[PDB]
């Protein structure tokens, strides 16, 4: 799953992540707990402090965090997660 861009939503407690590559199946689903049935990315994101719940559909992900948590900390990490494998460079 490679990020194209991350946008805001009507509910500021969750962010919208637009992907080029999506889940094996681009059907809708909801993940709240860490487990093997989730994408590696989704597990990491869940483990990120502040992240409350994740919703997947089509080719974008809605990531919702707790009221106390701030996107200043969380979002950068979430973005990194997808980059972990899809990192690009010119070394």
Protein topology:
Elements (H helix, E strand, L loop, with lengths): L2 E5 L6 E6 L9 E3 L8 H8 L3 E7 L2 E6 L5 H16 L5
Antiparallel strand pairs: 1-2, 2-5, 3-4, 4-5
Description:
By secondary structure, the protein is an alpha+beta fold. It has a single domain (1-91), classed as 2-Layer Sandwich (Ribosomal Protein S8, Chain: A, domain 1), CATH 3.30.1370.70. It is 26% helix and 30% strand. It has two helices and five strands. It has helices at 40-47, 71-86, and strands spanning 3-7, 14-19, 29-31, 51-57, 60-65. A five-stranded antiparallel beta sheet has the order 1-2-5-4-3, with helices on one face. A hairpin with a 6-residue loop joins strand 1 and strand 2 (14-19). Helix 1 packs antiparallel against helix 2. The two termini are 23 Å apart.
Quantity of strands, as a count:
5
Structural class: alpha+beta
Oligomer: monomer
Strand order in space, largest sheet: 1-2-5-4-3
Q: If you compute it from the alpha carbons, what radius of gyration comes out, rounded to the nearest whole angstrom?
A: 12 Å
Tell me the β content.
25-35%
CATH topology: Ribosomal Protein S8, Chain: A, domain 1
CATH class: Alpha Beta
- Any idea what the CATH superfamily is called? Scaffold protein Nfu/NifU, N-terminal domain
Shape, principal axes of CA atoms: globular
- CATH architecture type: 2-Layer Sandwich
Report, as a whole number of angstroms, the end-to-end distance: 23 Å
Largest sheet: 5 strands, antiparallel
Count of folded domains:
1
Helix content: 25-40%
In N-to-C order, the SSE pattern is EEEHEEH
Count the DSSP helices: 2
